[PDB]
Tab-separated table of C-alpha atoms and ligand atoms in Angstrom:
chain	number	residue	atom	x	y	z
A	1	UNK	CA	141.390	19.350	82.614
A	2	UNK	CA	143.209	15.581	82.681
A	3	UNK	CA	141.423	13.332	82.367
A	4	UNK	CA	143.468	9.423	80.948
A	5	UNK	CA	140.601	7.462	79.814
A	6	UNK	CA	142.120	4.445	78.089
A	7	UNK	CA	139.960	3.179	75.417
A	8	UNK	CA	137.412	0.102	75.489
A	9	UNK	CA	137.468	-3.414	73.267
A	10	UNK	CA	136.583	-3.875	69.905
A	11	UNK	CA	135.654	-6.849	69.047
A	12	UNK	CA	136.712	-6.890	64.836
A	13	UNK	CA	134.532	-9.170	62.432
A	14	UNK	CA	135.421	-8.753	59.615
A	15	UNK	CA	137.964	-11.716	58.337
A	16	UNK	CA	141.350	-11.449	60.146
A	17	UNK	CA	142.879	-12.359	57.033
A	18	UNK	CA	141.037	-9.134	55.301
A	19	UNK	CA	143.298	-7.652	57.436
A	20	UNK	CA	146.231	-10.306	58.332
A	21	UNK	CA	148.436	-12.653	56.676
A	22	UNK	CA	148.311	-15.762	58.365
A	23	UNK	CA	150.950	-18.012	58.125
A	24	UNK	CA	151.027	-21.396	59.418
A	25	UNK	CA	154.249	-21.618	62.116
A	26	UNK	CA	153.567	-22.136	65.623
A	27	UNK	CA	154.324	-20.560	68.448
A	28	UNK	CA	153.678	-21.464	71.282
A	29	UNK	CA	151.239	-24.812	72.137
A	30	UNK	CA	147.770	-24.062	74.680
A	31	UNK	CA	144.737	-26.223	75.270
A	32	UNK	CA	143.447	-24.567	72.128
A	33	UNK	CA	146.627	-25.573	70.049
A	34	UNK	CA	148.732	-23.643	68.234
A	35	UNK	CA	149.444	-19.917	68.374
A	36	UNK	CA	150.357	-18.895	64.998
A	37	UNK	CA	152.811	-15.881	63.280
A	38	UNK	CA	150.792	-13.449	61.314
A	39	UNK	CA	152.193	-10.253	59.537
A	40	UNK	CA	149.919	-7.156	58.914
A	41	UNK	CA	148.926	-6.755	55.635
A	42	UNK	CA	149.636	-2.546	55.993
A	43	UNK	CA	152.266	-2.523	58.337
A	44	UNK	CA	153.633	-5.687	57.295
A	45	UNK	CA	154.768	-5.999	61.265
A	46	UNK	CA	155.147	-9.776	63.004
A	47	UNK	CA	152.353	-10.629	65.395
A	48	UNK	CA	151.514	-14.582	67.707
A	49	UNK	CA	148.205	-15.327	66.673
A	50	UNK	CA	145.582	-16.984	69.113
A	51	UNK	CA	142.638	-19.190	68.415
A	52	UNK	CA	139.944	-19.820	70.579
A	53	UNK	CA	136.845	-20.817	70.330
A	54	UNK	CA	134.001	-18.522	70.932
A	55	UNK	CA	132.012	-19.218	74.706
A	56	UNK	CA	131.863	-17.747	77.885
A	57	UNK	CA	134.944	-19.107	79.160
A	58	UNK	CA	137.418	-17.812	75.705
A	59	UNK	CA	135.472	-14.434	76.737
A	60	UNK	CA	136.249	-14.200	79.530
A	61	UNK	CA	140.174	-14.481	78.539
A	62	UNK	CA	140.359	-11.745	77.271
A	63	UNK	CA	138.296	-9.330	79.232
A	64	UNK	CA	140.879	-9.754	81.280
A	65	UNK	CA	144.159	-10.056	79.257
A	66	UNK	CA	142.685	-6.988	77.185
A	67	UNK	CA	141.750	-4.942	80.806
A	68	UNK	CA	145.588	-5.962	81.274
A	69	UNK	CA	147.340	-4.841	78.097
A	70	UNK	CA	147.949	-1.356	79.791
A	71	UNK	CA	150.431	-2.873	81.916
A	72	UNK	CA	154.648	-2.915	80.870
A	73	UNK	CA	155.405	-5.429	81.585
A	74	UNK	CA	151.619	-7.950	80.194
A	75	UNK	CA	151.893	-8.977	76.383
A	76	UNK	CA	150.206	-6.571	74.387
A	77	UNK	CA	146.541	-7.206	72.803
A	78	UNK	CA	146.561	-5.532	69.806
A	79	UNK	CA	143.213	-6.110	68.169
A	80	UNK	CA	139.865	-9.290	68.778
A	81	UNK	CA	138.140	-10.434	65.926
A	82	UNK	CA	135.139	-12.197	65.930
A	83	UNK	CA	134.409	-14.713	63.111
A	84	UNK	CA	132.861	-18.290	61.747
A	85	UNK	CA	135.911	-21.038	61.083
A	86	UNK	CA	134.203	-24.259	60.295
A	87	UNK	CA	130.356	-22.909	61.056
A	88	UNK	CA	131.895	-22.193	64.508
A	89	UNK	CA	132.415	-19.156	66.712
A	90	UNK	CA	135.522	-17.994	67.206
A	91	UNK	CA	138.244	-15.502	69.239
A	92	UNK	CA	141.132	-15.200	67.356
A	93	UNK	CA	143.550	-12.900	69.464
A	94	UNK	CA	146.477	-10.852	67.936
A	95	UNK	CA	148.476	-10.444	69.980
A	96	UNK	CA	152.606	-9.092	69.941
A	97	UNK	CA	155.256	-10.899	69.506
A	98	UNK	CA	157.659	-11.685	71.494
A	99	UNK	CA	160.570	-12.878	69.565
A	100	UNK	CA	163.085	-13.924	72.466
A	101	UNK	CA	161.240	-16.718	72.864
A	102	UNK	CA	160.640	-18.548	76.991
A	103	UNK	CA	163.146	-16.728	80.179
A	104	UNK	CA	165.089	-19.981	79.992
A	105	UNK	CA	166.255	-20.215	76.883
A	106	UNK	CA	167.787	-17.066	76.956
A	107	UNK	CA	169.449	-17.649	80.218
A	108	UNK	CA	170.803	-20.746	79.036
A	109	UNK	CA	172.517	-19.680	76.181
A	110	UNK	CA	174.913	-17.523	77.800
A	111	UNK	CA	177.065	-19.658	78.325
A	112	UNK	CA	179.878	-17.672	77.848
A	113	UNK	CA	179.966	-14.254	79.657
A	114	UNK	CA	177.674	-15.326	83.538
A	115	UNK	CA	174.712	-15.071	85.064
A	116	UNK	CA	174.342	-12.224	87.701
A	117	UNK	CA	172.311	-12.094	90.799
A	118	UNK	CA	171.833	-8.719	90.152
A	119	UNK	CA	170.383	-9.852	86.122
A	120	UNK	CA	168.464	-12.399	88.697
A	121	UNK	CA	166.294	-9.248	90.549
A	122	UNK	CA	165.876	-7.537	87.259
A	123	UNK	CA	163.909	-10.454	86.123
A	124	UNK	CA	162.067	-10.525	89.266
A	125	UNK	CA	161.540	-6.853	89.046
A	126	UNK	CA	159.536	-7.318	86.146
A	127	UNK	CA	157.630	-10.504	86.458
A	128	UNK	CA	156.515	-8.433	89.693
A	129	UNK	CA	155.311	-5.565	88.076
A	130	UNK	CA	153.018	-7.271	85.738
A	131	UNK	CA	151.447	-9.348	89.176
A	132	UNK	CA	151.664	-6.343	90.189
A	133	UNK	CA	149.712	-4.485	88.293
A	134	UNK	CA	147.687	-7.890	87.741
A	135	UNK	CA	146.433	-7.737	91.340
A	136	UNK	CA	145.419	-3.950	91.914
A	137	UNK	CA	142.809	-4.238	89.271
A	138	UNK	CA	141.591	-7.814	90.764
A	139	UNK	CA	142.875	-10.274	88.908
A	140	UNK	CA	144.657	-12.648	89.704
A	141	UNK	CA	146.795	-15.268	87.172
A	142	UNK	CA	146.923	-18.560	88.118
A	143	UNK	CA	149.788	-19.818	85.134
A	144	UNK	CA	152.520	-17.125	85.724
A	145	UNK	CA	155.096	-20.624	85.083
A	146	UNK	CA	158.752	-20.680	82.861
A	147	UNK	CA	156.890	-21.398	79.867
A	148	UNK	CA	154.579	-17.610	79.805
A	149	UNK	CA	157.356	-15.129	80.412
A	150	UNK	CA	158.581	-14.348	76.914
A	151	UNK	CA	161.126	-11.639	75.402
A	152	UNK	CA	160.208	-9.013	73.594
A	153	UNK	CA	163.600	-10.011	71.724
A	154	UNK	CA	166.861	-10.807	71.340
A	155	UNK	CA	168.656	-8.092	72.335
A	156	UNK	CA	170.073	-7.815	75.932
A	157	UNK	CA	168.468	-5.304	77.059
A	158	UNK	CA	164.580	-6.665	75.538
A	159	UNK	CA	161.316	-6.166	77.932
A	160	UNK	CA	160.797	-9.857	79.969
A	161	UNK	CA	156.789	-10.433	79.062
A	162	UNK	CA	153.203	-12.687	80.733
A	163	UNK	CA	151.588	-14.130	78.125
A	164	UNK	CA	148.036	-15.955	78.869
A	165	UNK	CA	145.390	-16.040	80.253
A	166	UNK	CA	143.495	-19.021	80.447
A	167	UNK	CA	143.768	-19.404	83.164
A	168	UNK	CA	142.980	-15.557	85.315
A	169	UNK	CA	140.346	-15.194	87.474
A	170	UNK	CA	138.540	-12.300	88.904
A	171	UNK	CA	139.113	-11.303	92.389
A	172	UNK	CA	135.787	-8.790	93.325
A	173	UNK	CA	129.755	4.268	101.855
A	174	UNK	CA	131.588	7.641	103.667
A	175	UNK	CA	132.918	6.957	107.032
A	176	UNK	CA	136.160	4.730	105.101
A	177	UNK	CA	139.584	5.805	106.158
A	178	UNK	CA	139.492	2.774	109.355
A	179	UNK	CA	137.886	-0.077	107.791
A	180	UNK	CA	140.168	-3.275	107.688
A	181	UNK	CA	140.160	-4.738	104.542
A	182	UNK	CA	138.076	-7.934	105.536
A	183	UNK	CA	135.371	-6.339	105.640
A	184	UNK	CA	135.477	-4.883	101.921
A	185	UNK	CA	134.117	-8.145	100.763
A	186	UNK	CA	135.601	-12.141	100.438
A	187	UNK	CA	137.763	-12.525	98.461
A	188	UNK	CA	139.773	-15.928	99.540
A	189	UNK	CA	143.544	-16.360	99.330
A	190	UNK	CA	143.371	-16.526	95.194
A	191	UNK	CA	145.820	-13.978	94.427
A	192	UNK	CA	148.823	-16.126	96.798
A	193	UNK	CA	149.252	-18.648	94.025
A	194	UNK	CA	151.099	-15.962	91.879
A	195	UNK	CA	152.958	-15.618	94.696
A	196	UNK	CA	154.374	-19.167	94.348
A	197	UNK	CA	154.911	-19.251	90.985
A	198	UNK	CA	157.242	-16.680	92.258
A	199	UNK	CA	159.240	-17.673	94.566
A	200	UNK	CA	159.479	-21.291	91.954
A	201	UNK	CA	160.578	-18.925	89.435
A	202	UNK	CA	162.838	-17.203	91.737
A	203	UNK	CA	164.590	-20.023	93.008
A	204	UNK	CA	164.924	-22.100	89.056
A	205	UNK	CA	166.588	-18.212	88.518
A	206	UNK	CA	169.402	-19.055	90.786
A	207	UNK	CA	170.714	-21.911	90.242
A	208	UNK	CA	168.916	-23.929	87.571
A	209	UNK	CA	166.150	-26.028	89.087
A	210	UNK	CA	163.510	-26.382	90.420
A	211	UNK	CA	162.624	-26.349	94.209
A	212	UNK	CA	160.603	-29.421	93.920
A	213	UNK	CA	162.123	-32.094	91.601
A	214	UNK	CA	160.774	-35.104	89.939
A	215	UNK	CA	162.558	-38.423	90.510
A	216	UNK	CA	160.178	-40.835	88.643
A	217	UNK	CA	158.913	-44.332	90.086
A	218	UNK	CA	157.696	-43.749	94.745
A	219	UNK	CA	157.530	-40.813	96.628
A	220	UNK	CA	159.688	-39.043	94.004
A	221	UNK	CA	156.531	-38.292	91.854
A	222	UNK	CA	153.826	-38.721	94.393
A	223	UNK	CA	156.286	-38.202	96.747
A	224	UNK	CA	157.703	-35.199	95.278
A	225	UNK	CA	153.521	-34.274	95.107
A	226	UNK	CA	154.130	-34.338	99.442
A	227	UNK	CA	156.821	-33.378	99.390
A	228	UNK	CA	155.230	-29.775	97.465
A	229	UNK	CA	152.369	-30.896	100.664
A	230	UNK	CA	155.070	-30.535	102.795
A	231	UNK	CA	156.752	-27.864	101.680
A	232	UNK	CA	160.461	-29.874	101.912
A	233	UNK	CA	163.253	-28.386	99.491
A	234	UNK	CA	167.040	-27.690	100.454
A	235	UNK	CA	169.483	-25.058	99.177
A	236	UNK	CA	172.139	-27.690	98.289
A	237	UNK	CA	175.889	-26.375	98.338
A	238	UNK	CA	177.768	-25.427	95.937
A	239	UNK	CA	174.910	-23.324	94.607
A	240	UNK	CA	173.742	-21.493	97.226
A	241	UNK	CA	176.869	-21.773	98.912
A	242	UNK	CA	177.710	-18.043	98.652
A	243	UNK	CA	173.597	-16.902	97.836
A	244	UNK	CA	172.800	-13.703	100.373
A	245	UNK	CA	170.688	-14.734	103.803
A	246	UNK	CA	168.695	-12.267	102.811
A	247	UNK	CA	167.779	-14.122	99.391
A	248	UNK	CA	167.372	-17.795	100.709
A	249	UNK	CA	164.804	-15.810	103.688
A	250	UNK	CA	162.275	-14.305	99.803
A	251	UNK	CA	162.322	-17.255	98.807
A	252	UNK	CA	161.064	-19.001	101.622
A	253	UNK	CA	158.375	-16.408	102.560
A	254	UNK	CA	157.299	-17.146	98.998
A	255	UNK	CA	156.768	-20.989	99.560
A	256	UNK	CA	155.788	-21.152	102.876
A	257	UNK	CA	152.942	-23.958	102.333
A	258	UNK	CA	150.079	-22.013	104.489
A	259	UNK	CA	148.672	-19.671	101.274
A	260	UNK	CA	147.837	-17.172	104.209
A	261	UNK	CA	151.196	-17.186	105.341
A	262	UNK	CA	152.554	-16.310	102.032
A	263	UNK	CA	154.565	-12.673	101.333
A	264	UNK	CA	152.223	-10.454	98.994
A	265	UNK	CA	152.722	-8.691	95.493
A	266	UNK	CA	152.967	-4.869	97.481
A	267	UNK	CA	155.209	-6.379	100.698
A	268	UNK	CA	157.443	-8.894	97.640
A	269	UNK	CA	158.325	-5.245	95.488
A	270	UNK	CA	158.883	-3.437	98.987
A	271	UNK	CA	161.236	-6.158	99.672
A	272	UNK	CA	165.116	-4.605	99.521
A	273	UNK	CA	166.325	-7.627	97.160
A	274	UNK	CA	163.419	-6.095	94.919
A	275	UNK	CA	163.240	-2.414	95.138
A	276	UNK	CA	167.432	-2.208	94.816
A	277	UNK	CA	167.678	-4.505	91.601
A	278	UNK	CA	169.706	-1.785	90.722
A	279	UNK	CA	172.054	-2.586	94.035
A	280	UNK	CA	171.936	-6.048	94.296
A	281	UNK	CA	175.953	-7.770	94.244
A	282	UNK	CA	177.020	-8.663	90.880
A	283	UNK	CA	178.031	-12.040	91.690
A	284	UNK	CA	177.876	-15.102	89.479
A	285	UNK	CA	174.892	-17.866	89.297
A	286	UNK	CA	175.298	-20.752	87.970
A	287	UNK	CA	172.332	-20.860	86.166
A	288	UNK	CA	173.234	-20.984	82.908
A	289	UNK	CA	175.739	-24.048	83.168
A	290	UNK	CA	172.933	-25.816	85.065
A	291	UNK	CA	170.239	-25.391	82.526
A	292	UNK	CA	172.947	-27.125	80.660
A	293	UNK	CA	172.161	-30.594	81.152
A	294	UNK	CA	168.642	-31.754	80.791
A	295	UNK	CA	167.361	-34.418	78.051
B	1	P4O	O1	148.590	-17.739	75.874
B	1	P4O	C1	148.785	-18.488	75.322
B	1	P4O	N1	149.237	-19.721	75.366
B	1	P4O	C2	149.922	-20.836	75.110
B	1	P4O	C3	151.771	-20.021	75.075
B	1	P4O	C4	151.683	-18.825	74.338
B	1	P4O	N2	152.301	-18.865	73.950
B	1	P4O	C5	152.374	-17.103	72.966
B	1	P4O	C6	152.968	-16.666	72.921
B	1	P4O	C7	152.857	-15.515	72.218
B	1	P4O	C8	153.320	-14.413	71.988
B	1	P4O	N3	154.502	-14.066	71.357
B	1	P4O	C9	154.730	-16.275	70.837
B	1	P4O	C10	155.865	-16.459	70.870
B	1	P4O	C11	156.474	-15.492	69.474
B	1	P4O	N4	157.514	-15.573	68.483
B	1	P4O	C12	159.155	-16.950	69.343
B	1	P4O	C13	159.665	-17.351	68.553
B	1	P4O	C14	160.028	-17.917	69.073
B	1	P4O	C15	159.841	-18.790	69.779
B	1	P4O	C16	158.613	-18.181	70.666
B	1	P4O	C17	157.863	-17.090	70.433
B	1	P4O	C18	157.524	-17.606	70.888
B	1	P4O	C19	153.836	-16.143	71.597
B	1	P4O	C20	150.468	-17.075	73.732
B	1	P4O	C21	150.598	-18.491	74.651
């Protein structure tokens, strides 16, 4: 006994409206247009619905995302319909619904507490688990941005989840103990960008602005673009003046220009600042206030 097998992906073919109420309310915009809010007729719970045109690229997204839904920090696909819509075959993905909206909106909507270093570590921890899960099953997510980190609720014990698989990609014997990873097949620097994303999201969490900011004109967005190439960014005071040299070093290691230089997800999770989420200094960060400065 003891055989943990979860179930396979099942493309439902009946009309989705047979099983759910479909609203006009929008929950997100993508290249495939709207994410809608819907309601399960039976249970009456709320779900997000993403609609893609059926085709090989769409199918992969679904498949990868289904594969990854077993991860606690990745938006769970709850079921998938293939229907006809204007004589065009379609994939309708029904996922769990993340009311807490986007990661940054939440921080920026404190302003009456203060957002500690430790709170950020915990955040980065949970994004890490998501990447970790992904990479260990040989998927690179490849669009890990702010916009795709949302919260299950407004409740402060909300759990933070990764969404959007439109750019995810697969990365893919008896004397094996000693064989070097490079001999176990190709897989060229592909999951390493997920690592860069992580650096950026960490930078912003700690201060409230990207490490590579625009400016507009010339050498200010064409230059903002070489700024990235050169890997040039500061830790300007007085935001960073109070931040652990250990943390700076961690960002520095994620924001490495040459991808093979950059840290692995595994190395990441074993890092003390991430591994001791709990015992990180309670120190007050500017983040929330700085965020409030915008459009
Ligand atoms: O895959 C995607 N591509 C485009 C952006 C996006 N949002 C979602 C999404 C998924 C699940 N829930 C939501 C969501 C739910 N409820 C919300 C309430 C208030 C603000 C944002 C919300 C987002 C968005 C998925 C995708």
